[PDB]
Each structure stands twice: as structure tokens, then as C-alpha cells.
């Protein structure tokens, strides 16, 4: 990678990435755990880089009607980027189209709700009541995992829930009450740290990883993987999580 | 790309390491000698991907480490590098030394380093305390992952731990030494969880430390990595790996 230039797909997703929309130029508009990883990779491997956001602002899912991707996944497949540098969850749908780097973090699906003492014990119970609404964000990993689960009652949850635009919309809706938001543990841990009236619904389920996304046959995968493994082994990832997560 | 596994015959590196693999030494032939969590994964992969297979054990019965004097590997890693095997099918820990020489599949389990101790009286809170006392002896198994992680660690007191500890040949030798008392064995969480379940007089030394994964080992440029990775990810996503851990790992505790 010495001398090379990498186009990196990314979007804001706190605390992994923060994007300043004003008051900055170029790479300096970006900060966060993933940015710190990229900066260290660029120093050690000798590449320059820039970040490219998807125009549709989505992470990426496969639309089964059109058989087309959107989001950062689509930008990668379209060769607009060389790597996706974000908390990119591992799932089989994506794995059919792209590769993943060595992982940097473990993660699970977590469901949360406002108000102490919820009667809900498990998310499928939502289908048998009408006190609570619920939802997942469109074109993001949790939606895909639930839609591909062997138990099609999870597809019902997705199909019958509110389609949320983005993390801000989801958290707003959650804070509005009587609403179960289903998303990812680490993201919820950070972003709801001060919401003392928000509680888990059931236990976390599904085990997956956060990694970077790479095109199949990327000439850079070996080096990125080696360096990411070293980051984990040396404790750098843990140090960055402590730096960036609340708190 | 074009190459797939249909009709291929894979040679798989493995050794006994309960509950991942059990190897019967009599009364069986060939693949039928093997059982366990990893064997169940291999069987399912073979059916879905269309290969036949056999297991090949290293004569040295080592997992594999890099000798800094000779710059040569040993164990299953060496057999893979020497084309005796096509994949290492075991609880193979991810570390940077191995990553310099081989690739890994998609991971099937998370793991950490765990230290355990047998002994009455004063005890220990963290493994580096071992260096400033002589009540307890201690050890790691040679040419296995925990030894490599401790020798790699940027705090060279962990290299001291390895260099000044007792040499342990294999997991059976380590566990018998631990059971002998006044000993700290430093190894891996899942292995110790399963194998020490009924040792009510064995306790922890501090918290687990280091994060790594168990995966399968693949040679660089293997034409089979993409398929194995996809299928392993599907196993994880479908909950198959969790079901196999429940099936094979020890339950209850007399303790």
C-alpha cells in the first residue's frame, strides 16, 4: 500500500465515526474510533486516503425484488470505493457479494424500550399485542438478519414494524415512548448511555462481528487483515473503545 | 473463482483437544476415529461442499509456533506450510505470528487467555505476581498459542513468565501438573471451562486477558478459503456453532 490512495466508504455512526458538516476540510471532517484506526493504518502502511459517503446515506442491503444493493455496499460493488471503513456487520447476504477484513469487535442484536417495567420478555411477543410499536432501520444489518432468520416470525417483525430512516430517527422514536427499537449492542450502549429510562427487551441474540468491507480479490486484504489483527492483539482496539465510548 | 471443492479430497490437520476433537486410539479406522464439535462442523462442510477428507496429526503433537532461532515452524502450522494438509480443523487461535505465515478462516468462537490455580493459603490476583514469589510454580504449553501471546506481549515481563515457567508438553501434562497443586496453568478460556469443570479446588487468577478467535487455518492463496469462510459464517448466523457447543461442552458441575 505504500504510495497508494484508498477511497474509503463511511458514514457517521457514533462513536465509530463522527462527520462534521461544516468548519472543516477533507479528512479532518472525520473523527472517532474507526477514524483513529484508519489514521494508524495509513501511517504504518503508507497510503493516503479519502472518505466517500453514499449518496443514499445507507449502510446497504440487497433488495430481493430488484436484486440490487444500495448504500456503502453498492458504492463498493460499483468501484466507487476500495474499502468500507465503519462498524460493518458480518452477514451472509453481504458475504455473497463482498469480503470482510479481520474483525475488530464482537456484536449482537439488542432490543430496547422506554419505560421501566415493560411486560415484554422477548421481541416476538410484539406480534401478539398492540400497546407497543417497534422497528428497525431500513438497509441496515439488523433488518437483514431478522429477514433472513429461519423463523419467519422475525420477517413478520420487520414487515409489520415501522421502517426507520436512520439512527437519529430511531432514537427519537424510542424516546417518544411505547416503541421497541431493535438494533446493535455497541451502538445502543454508546448512544443511550444517558437514557436512564431505557431498558433492554430480552437478551441479546445472534453473534456477529464488526469488520471492514473489501471487494472480492482486493489486493489489499492481506495487509489490512494482518494490521487489524495486530491492533487487536496489542490492545489498540480496546484502548480506542475506552477513548471513544461513553462513559 | 472457478475452483470449488466438489470432488476434492482434503487433508485436514487436527489433534485431540476436548471438546473440539476426540481421537480414539483403537477400535476404529480412518475418519471414524474422530468426534467432537470440530468434527461435526467438518462433516457438515463436507456434505454441503462435496469434498471427502481425512485427518492428519503432526508427529510432534504441537499446535504450532515459530522458532526464533531457526525461523522454522512446527506442529500443525508446519504441516500446512509443507502441503501435508489443506486446512487446520481445530480450535486454532488467531495470532500475529501465525498470520505472517498462514491465513485464517472466518472465526467460529471468541476466546481469551485464562489463568487458573490450585492451592490453599495465600493466592494470586494477577499472573505477573508469580515473578515475585516462590510458593507457586507455573507454566504454559510449548508451541501453543498462549505461549506465543505471552512471548509477543510488549511488556517483556510476560516473556519472563514463559522463560522461567515449567515446560509443559501438552494439555494432559498441563492438567496433571495443575492437579498436582501449588501451580498456575495459563491457557485458554473455553478449553479450561470444559476440561476443569469438575475440579472444585481449581480457581481463577484474575480476569481473562487478550481477545482472540478460534478459526480454521488455511494456506495463503488457498482456492478454498472463500467457500469455507462463507459456510462458516452461515453456521454462526444460523446458530449451529452455539448448538454444537451446547452439545459437546461439559455441563453441570459437582462443585
Dist. CA A14–CA B11, nearest whole Å: 45
Cβ neighbours, 10 Å, residue A125: 14
Q: Chain B: nearest CA to A5, how far in angstroms?
A: 24
Dist. CA A247–CA B64, nearest whole Å: 40
Residues A152, A213 contacting (CB under 8 angstroms): no
Burial bucket for residue A87 (CB in 10 Å: 0-12, 13-18, 19+): buried
Q: Indicate yes or no: CB of B226 within 8 angstroms of CB of A233.
A: no
Name the DSSP letter for residue A90.
-
Q: Is B230 on the interface with A (CB under 8 A)?
A: yes
Class of B112-211 in CATH: alpha beta
Residues A180, A168 contacting (CB under 8 angstroms): no
Dist. CA A159–CA A90, nearest whole Å: 22
Identical topology for domains A1-107+208-247 and A108-207? yes
Question: CA triplet B145, B150, B156: central angle to 5 degrees?
Answer: 160
Looking at CATH, the fold of the domain delimited by A1-107+208-247 is given as: D-Maltodextrin-Binding Protein; domain 2 (3.40.190)
Instruction: Return the closest-CA partner of residue A94 out of A217, A228, A214, A14.
Output: A214
Q: Give long-range contacts, CB 8 A cutoff, 24+ apart: B122-127.
A: B123/B203, B123/B205, B124/B184, B124/B205, B124/B206, B125/B205, B125/B206, B126/B205, B126/B206, B127/B161, B127/B184, B127/B186, B127/B205, B127/B206
Dist. CA A55–CA A81, nearest whole Å: 13
Q: How was this structure determined?
A: X-ray
Residues A136, A161 contacting (CB under 8 angstroms): yes
Question: CA triplet B107, B110, B112: central angle to 5 degrees?
Answer: 130
Mutation choice for A interface testing from B148, B226, B237, B238 by most A CBs within 10 A? B237
Instruction: Return the closest-CA partner of residue B17 out of B38, B44, B42.
Output: B38
Sign for the CA dihedral angle at B78, B81, B85, B91 comes to: positive
What lies within 8 Å, CB to CB, of A172 at 6+ separation is none
Residues B111, B215 contacting (CB under 8 angstroms): no
Q: Chain A: nearest CA to B92, how far in angstroms?
A: 14
Dist. CA A239–CA A233, nearest whole Å: 12
Dist. CA A131–CA A152, nearest whole Å: 22
Residues B21, B15 contacting (CB under 8 angstroms): yes
Q: Is A92 on the interface with B (CB under 8 A)?
A: yes
Class of A108-207 in CATH: alpha beta
What residues does each domain of chain B span?
1-111+212-255, 112-211
Residues of B in contact with A106 (CB under 8 A): 110
Residues of B in contact with A92 (CB under 8 A): 230, 233-234, 237
CATH code that applies to domain B1-111+212-255: 3.40.190.10
CA–CA distance from B229 to each of A48, B223, B249 (Å)?
A: 30, 11, 24
C-alpha cell at B124: 494470586
Amino acid at each position: 500500500l505504500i504510495g497508494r490512495h484508498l477511497r474509503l466508504g463511511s458514514v457517521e455512526e457514533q462513536p465509530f465515526m463522527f462527520f462534521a458538516t461544516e468548519g472543516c476540510e477533507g479528512n479532518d471532517c472525520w473523527s472517532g474510533m474507526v477514524n483513529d484506526m484508519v489514521v494508524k493504518l495509513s501511517e504504518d502502511l503508507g497510503f493516503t486516503y479519502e472518505y466517500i459517503q453514499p449518496d443514499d446515506r445507507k449502510f446497504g442491503a440487497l433488495n430481493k425484488t430488484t436484486n440490487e444493493w444500495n448504500g456503502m455496499i453498492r458504492d463498493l460493488l460499483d468501484d466507487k470505493t476500495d474499502m468500507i471503513a465503519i462498524d460493518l456487520s458480518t452477514n451472509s447476504a453481504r458475504k455473497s457479494a463482498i469480503d470482510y477484513s479481520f474483525p475488530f469487535m464482537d456484536a449482537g442484536i439488542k432490543a430496547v424500550v422506554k419505560g421501566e417495567g415493560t411486560t415484554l420478555n422477548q421481541v416476538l411477543e410484539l406480534l401478539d399485542q398492540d400497546k407497543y410499536k417497534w422497528g428497525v432501520i431500513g438497509s441496515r444489518h439488523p433488518e437483514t438478519l431478522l429477514k433472513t432468520h429461519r423463523d419467519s416470525r422475525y420477517s413478520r417483525l420487520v414487515d409489520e414494524g415501522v421502517e426507520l430512516k436512520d439512527l437519529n430517527h430511531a432514537i427519537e422514536t424510542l424516546r417518544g415512548g411505547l416503541f421497541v427499537f431493535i438494533d446493535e449492542g455497541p451502538v445502543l450502549a454508546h448512544n443511550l448511555i444517558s437514557d436512564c429510562d431505557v431498558f433492554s427487551v430480552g437478551e441479546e441474540f445472534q453473534s456477529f462481528e464488526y469488520a471492514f468491507g473489501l471487494p472480492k480479490d482486493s489486493p489489499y486484504k492481506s495487509l489490512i487483515d494482518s494490521h487489524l489483527l495486530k491492533f487487536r492483539e496489542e490492545g489498540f482496539i480496546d484502548i480506542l473503545w475506552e477513548k471513544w465510548s461513553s462513559g
